[PDB]
Amino acid sequence: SVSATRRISRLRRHTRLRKKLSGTAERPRLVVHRSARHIHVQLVNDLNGTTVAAASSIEADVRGVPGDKKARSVRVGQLIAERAKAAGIDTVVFDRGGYTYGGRIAALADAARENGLSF
Amino acid sequence: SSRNGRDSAAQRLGVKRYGGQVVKAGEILVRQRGTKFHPGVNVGRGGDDTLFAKTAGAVEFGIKRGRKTVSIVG
Amino acid sequence: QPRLKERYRSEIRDALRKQFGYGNVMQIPTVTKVVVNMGVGEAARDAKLINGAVNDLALITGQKPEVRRARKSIAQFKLREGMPVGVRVTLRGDRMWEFLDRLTSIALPRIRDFRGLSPKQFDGVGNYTFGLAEQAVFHEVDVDKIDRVRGMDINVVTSAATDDEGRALLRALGFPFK
Amino acid sequence: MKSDIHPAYEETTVVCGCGNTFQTRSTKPGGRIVVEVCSQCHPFYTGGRVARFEKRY
Amino acid sequence: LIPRKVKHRKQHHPRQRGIASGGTTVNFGDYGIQALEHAYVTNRQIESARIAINRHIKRGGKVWINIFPDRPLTKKPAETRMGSGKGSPEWWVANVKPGRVLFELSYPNEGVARAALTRAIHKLPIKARIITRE
Amino acid sequence: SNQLRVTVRTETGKGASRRARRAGKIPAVLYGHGAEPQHLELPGHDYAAVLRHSGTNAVLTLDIAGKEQLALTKALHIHPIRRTIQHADLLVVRRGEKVVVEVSVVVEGQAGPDTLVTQETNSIEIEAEALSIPEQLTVSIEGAEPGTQLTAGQIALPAGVSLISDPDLLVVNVVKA
RNA sequence: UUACGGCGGCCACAGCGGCAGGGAAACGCCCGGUCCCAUUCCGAACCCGGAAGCUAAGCCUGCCAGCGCCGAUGAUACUGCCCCUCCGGGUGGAAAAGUAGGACACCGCCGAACA
RNA sequence: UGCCUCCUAAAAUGUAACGGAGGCGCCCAAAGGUUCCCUCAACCUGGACGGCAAUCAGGUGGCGAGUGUAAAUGCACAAG
RNA sequence: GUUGCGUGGUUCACCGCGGAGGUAGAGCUACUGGAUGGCCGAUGGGUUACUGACGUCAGCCAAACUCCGA
Ligand SMILES: [Mg+2]
Ligand SMILES: [Mg+2]
Ligand SMILES: [Mg+2]
Ligand SMILES: [Mg+2]
Ligand SMILES: [Mg+2]
Ligand SMILES: [Mg+2]
Ligand SMILES: [Mg+2]
Ligand SMILES: [Mg+2]
Ligand SMILES: [Mg+2]
Ligand SMILES: [Mg+2]
Ligand SMILES: [Mg+2]
Ligand SMILES: [Mg+2]
Ligand SMILES: [Mg+2]
Ligand SMILES: [Mg+2]
Ligand SMILES: [Mg+2]
Ligand SMILES: [Mg+2]
Ligand SMILES: [Mg+2]
Ligand SMILES: [Mg+2]
Ligand SMILES: [Mg+2]
Ligand SMILES: [Mg+2]
Ligand SMILES: [Zn+2]
Helix, strand or coil, rough: CCCCHHHHHHHHHHHHHCCCCCCCCCEEEEEEECCCCCCEEECCCCCCCCCCCCECCCHHHHCCCCCCCCHHHHHHHHHHHHHCCCCCCCCCCCECCCCCCCCHHHHHHHHHCCCCCCC | CCCCCCCCCCCCCEECCCCCECCCCCCCCECCCCCEECEEECCCCCCCCCCCCCCEEEEEEEEEEEEEEEECCC | CCCCHHHHHHHHHHHHHHHCCCCCCHCCCEEEEEEECCCCCCCCCCCCCHHHHHHHHHHHCCCCCEEECCCCCCCCCCCCCCCCEEEEECCHHHHHHHHHHHHHHHHHHHHCCCCCCCCCEECCCCCEEECCCCCCCCCCCCCCCCHHHCCCEEEEECCCCCHHHHHHHHHCCCCCCC | CCCCCCCCCCCEEEEEECCCCEEEECCCCCEECCCCCCCCCCCCCCCCCHHHHHCCC | CCCCCCCCCCCCCCCHHHHCCCCCCCCCCCCCEEEEEEEEEECHHHHHHHHHHHHHHHCCCCEEEECCEEEEEEEEECCCCCCCCEEEEEEEEEEECCCEEEEEEEEECCHHHHHHHHHHHCCCCCEEEEEECC | CCCCEECCCCCCCCHHHHHHHCCCEEEEEECCCCEEEEEEEECCCHHHHHCCCCHHHCCEEEEEEEEEEEEEEEEEEEECCCCCCEEEEEEEECCCCCCCCEEEEEEECCCCCCCEECCCCCCECCCCCEEEEECCCEEEECCCCCCCEEEECCCCCCCEEEECCCCCCCCEEEEEE
């Protein structure tokens, strides 16, 4: 199989970078989840497991943005940047999610550094 | 005659601070070869796997997915 | 658009729903890769396989091969670890369908005293493997500008679950059996 | 790595002595691979002591 | 009887204390010799106690030895002072605790079998008895 | 039909059990079927009588201070030197339940030529209900050539009895000499 | 509230295997290699652009103790301190193995459909 | 005869004997630093030379491989 | 060990609590080795009553064996 290979291989890449990157209450952790159609993102606070802010491409604001999938990654990257600042967050650590930094995720990350977050 | 008789020095390994015992910052907790214990919260490893303390507090032991760990409750 | 690929999804793809009773079109078997390697054991001596075993599989299959190294040392075979002993090329996608056409149409009946291929060479899941003679049959290499002759062996890896499910697939593509 | 290390692989026309011909993509320069036997003009694609004593006598 | 390899050529003496916990009932045959006190039963004492069972029943039946001499004992040379290294191995020994069953036997005749095991008890450096299958 | 008057233990431990074996009686527990276990005392010599004369599968009828209870015997703990029972593991049976029980296998017959008969296992496990129908399993041996061996498969077992161990255990084996 | 997606706790009472069933959004396979990027060869993987095809697989839910795991009670081994000449006894702790049985996990936060 | 690892050493540490076994007087300019990616051995089935075993392909496989070098403690999250 | 000056219950004993172990014992189809009797038989030996690897059903052993564990 290849669909069962890809889940096991990316949650092993996700555990490898998780040993050294955890994220706390004053510096939360921006966790991306990249599918073929959308991307989801949330700030997780790994001391009691509590998401403080979240944004996704499946809601109505990101769905009506013209262009490719990188431009919808920029739009969801601007949403969780302006939702982190409504909860008192201005510095986070960036969780790759097991993926490769580049493409849609680096377009999410660079669109969140322009709008306030300082990673 | 014999071909035996030589040994080495004793290296004084082992747990140097037990559970519940209040430590200072920088104190050597579990001196060992390898990772018999693993470092947890507020415990750094060390070069020869020495498991010192990073912040003053009390030592407590536990399990974190099969590997037994040393932590410090600040 | 290669002709063997379009002939596959025109009548080969539909005929396997009659010979085997599948309930879903995703279950229909499909060849996924064709792996070719020389396996040049006489490269632990004389160190000449770059000129001879790489310049020919590049011409046969289309893309440059990978040099494979030995995993463990064997004293009886005069071999080390990390020594170049094998040369492999993997064919995917549209260059797979063009190689499987060019193998079965014009190549494979140039074997000297050819009488067929055996249909008992399945591994148990549906993956065929045969072997060839030398730096003959393929026209893309010429007999005049080469070193010593050397053969190969060719895997064909399908998505079929069992043996005869892959035997019916390769009979339709054009492998001669007996 | 799928750039200027692989050899030339361009479209090619193959003819046979029988009259069958088709078009694929190969590495032969000029697109002029010419065979003398193919998948339709080859055999196997298209097809005791007692009896010799009687033939002598 | 002698082991063909052992890992450690020079071992300590095995410790003679405790009641046995394995091999305490008759498992194979119908009659068995059970030890009642400690000794180091050697391989010569077993070969001498088996050929005294076989030449009293003389055919038929089966003799099991569920005891093996796999513990070496050493000996210094004779006219030697104390302590210039541990000596080379000399004997082979099984550690026999009370309760342990040494030899077992099946035979059709209850009288000849119980009297053949008695001729093997007088070859052993222990006090032993003959127990039956319940 | 094995009456056996028992009593409940006052104090339980290493000391109170040594003062019971010297006082004739023998300690046991009665558990099973989800109830909490009772800690009870057997009369010793009388319980040893119903074991030598009815096997190790005698359905006992215990009398726990007036109250009546049926019980099998799951396991025993024989002392290795005194060869006396130390501890019985009694389990309750409420008048017909498929319990897992081992039972003896005996050997009947002879062998004509020079043939040695060595039977390996003394018992095979079966499933059966309450008050004990099953007993030892008589096996006939006519002494064939030593390429014939007798198995837990092809055993003579009555109705209500089903073999649960393995249908390949070698129970009777014959050889030359 | 749920035959639903994520992120953690926890690391087999949670694993393995077998038998059935599920596609609203979602996860997925899946159609392609012009663009960032990629293969010690290969758009398989990684990356990118798509939405024709489908729940076969993954994933999710239900059901079985076959294998694996958990597991007392009571007894025993061993043992501290005594009594005592050994043997054993008094008193305070008390396993491993096996048995009865347990078990096809449980809980926290966010999102989506609900309500 | 100094150093290093184990057992003796009696479940913290330490512990003698001309008690039981073994290593060291180096090696590596990558076998160091960092960032990313991968899972091994053994067994089974199919394959030109090719054999028990070279390279290929597919199943099975949770650590039995591996660690520059002796042993112990570690390491599959990998320190491979 | 004594004695001079400082410190003053910090020592020690018992009870309750928080903790690391790998001895005793036991176990080994949980590893590395040893090894008993069946069963199956790759190989080896002259077409086979001799050898019996690896496997499997029982019963075992260990200072430098440990899934466990006072
Ligand atoms: Mg030396
Ligand atoms: Mg030491
Ligand atoms: Mg250093
Ligand atoms: Mg034992
Ligand atoms: Mg849908
Ligand atoms: Mg693709
Ligand atoms: Mg389905
Ligand atoms: Mg208990
Ligand atoms: Mg237990
Ligand atoms: Mg110590
Ligand atoms: Mg001590
Ligand atoms: Mg490096
Ligand atoms: Mg590395
Ligand atoms: Mg305590
Ligand atoms: Mg303790
Ligand atoms: Mg030890
Ligand atoms: Mg012991
Ligand atoms: Mg063994
Ligand atoms: Mg054997
Ligand atoms: Mg031990
Ligand atoms: Zn032709």
